[PDB]
Amino acid sequence: GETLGEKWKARLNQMSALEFYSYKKSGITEVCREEARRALKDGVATGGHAVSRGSAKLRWLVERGYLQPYGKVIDLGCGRGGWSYYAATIRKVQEVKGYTKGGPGHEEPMLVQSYGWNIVRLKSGVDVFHMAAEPCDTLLCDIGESSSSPEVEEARTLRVLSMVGDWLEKRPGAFCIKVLCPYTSTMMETLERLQRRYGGGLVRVPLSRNSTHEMYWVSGAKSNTIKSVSTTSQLLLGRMDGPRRPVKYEEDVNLGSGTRAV
């Protein structure tokens, strides 16, 4: 039986360019990035700006208690560093190590001086699938590239989750892991097994675009896998009908400036 998410994906692939353009942000939550983009383009490192939209996504989770970062944070797939720099502002966090592949077509770490920047070490040139897991207190991972093929998205998600398992075996107390494809029958079974083994639960972040079914597996959630995924599928399906709905806005995160004592 085709799941609601698989029905959503088939409809998404049937949309014309114009339908997709109007659908992808219909009714979502967004931060306005115009000020940060201008400041970062002008080389301003001290204005508090987030380096990417990722800081707002992690903020949404942390402010609601979906995880409580602390201690040594490892950020797999850090990109420019939006999760790493947000984590560095958190009182209980004491060290942030981000790893990202970089190279052609992939974002490099951005060096800025938001609050806590001196406890952040971002390393490019690192493929985390070839990296030995190391102990940490908080494990973050934001890897997963969209594909028009749900079979490709499932294969990519299984690859991420297999890799993350090696890190979870070190028993971090807090975690946030992107799940690109939660919506196939096989994926829901896999995620249920992983929740039984490592805990946590799935949450949909409302800053995600309607064009992806990504959910985050986070240590502070506790929810039925099938219900949480199906509720998201129905939400995304419902937004395909009717008029385009307005975007809702937070102000972009401001991460301040200055160093931290450690």
Ligand SMILES: Nc1ncnc2c1ncn2[C@@H]1O[C@H](CN(CC[C@H](N)C(=O)O)Cc2ccc(F)cc2)[C@@H](O)[C@H]1O
């Ligand atoms: N195997 C990999 N090893 C290391 N880094 C990788 C690997 N595969 C992908 N990446 C990089 O992961 C980043 C994913 N970003 C992270 C955003 C970050 N949390 C922030 O807040 O700035 C999200 C993402 C972007 C594009 C996309 F298509 C899928 C995910 C990227 O920089 C990858 O190069």
Ligand SMILES: [Cl-]
């Ligand atoms: Cl990715």
Ligand SMILES: [Cl-]
């Ligand atoms: Cl991927």
Ligand SMILES: [Cl-]
């Ligand atoms: Cl929950």
Ligand code: NA
């Ligand atoms: Na690059």
